């Protein structure tokens, strides 16, 4: 059952080139969300009534409409260490939208 | 610039196989979200931070981290008449979720 659910993604700041702005943490778990939107669908996906019936009417025409998407549903915060204008690390105790929560089909 | 944006999406509810409990209407507009997520951004696409971090990170490993999904980011209801338990059609005046309102990058 290859369905829709969070794995794991470490994200290196300086291999995104936020390092720039960012002292610490290096690296952070950001997780992602991956698997299919097909049919038979699990529980803890959650699917709108737009991506459910957006997978049916791929099923009937794959080449002209897209399936639904294992996106994230809900986000989580972390900390980060960054310059101020004037150079001086100053903590960002909740940067919003930066880990995922929980992952659904839309 | 193809990005990410509401385009049409005309579902007929026989062609999913709703029509055993749907009366009507026969076809209803849906619209979907189509385009990709990729840099640089758009006004109307309201990112994520990790929508945009995912995405670097897919700039980087293609192979092991995919990109953004453009989805729904808000629905709208329709109105549908369907048959009650005991046969009597009944409207469902809000049947939410059905059709997109807007569209963003997740
Ligand atoms: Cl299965
Ligand atoms: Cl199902
Ligand atoms: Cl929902
Ligand atoms: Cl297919
Ligand atoms: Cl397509
Ligand atoms: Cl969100
Ligand atoms: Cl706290
Ligand atoms: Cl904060
Ligand atoms: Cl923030
Ligand atoms: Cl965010
Ligand atoms: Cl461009
Ligand atoms: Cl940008
Ligand atoms: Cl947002
Ligand atoms: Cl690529
Ligand atoms: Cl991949
Ligand atoms: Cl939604
Ligand atoms: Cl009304
Ligand atoms: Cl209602
Ligand atoms: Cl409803
Ligand atoms: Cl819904
Ligand atoms: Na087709
Ligand atoms: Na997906
Ligand atoms: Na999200
Ligand atoms: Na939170
Ligand atoms: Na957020
Ligand atoms: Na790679
Ligand atoms: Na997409
Ligand atoms: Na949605
Ligand atoms: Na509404
Ligand atoms: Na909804």
Not at 42 to 71: E, M, N, R, W, Y
Not at 95 to 101: F, K, L, R
């Amino acid at each position: 059952g290859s369905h829709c659910q969070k794995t794991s993604l470490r994200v290196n700041f300086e291999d995104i080139g936020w390092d720039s702005w960012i002292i610490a943490p290096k690296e952070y778990e950001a997780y992602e969300c991956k698997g299919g939107c097909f049919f038979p669908l699990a529980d803890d996906v959650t699917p709108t009534k737009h991506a459910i019936v957006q997978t049916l009417v791929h099923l009937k025409f794959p080449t002209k409409v897209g399936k639904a998407c294992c996106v994230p549903t809900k986000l989580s915060p972390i900390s980060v260490l960054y310059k101020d204008d004037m150079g001086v690390p100053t903590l960002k105790y909740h940067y919003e939208g930066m880990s995922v929560a929980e992952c659904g089909c839309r």
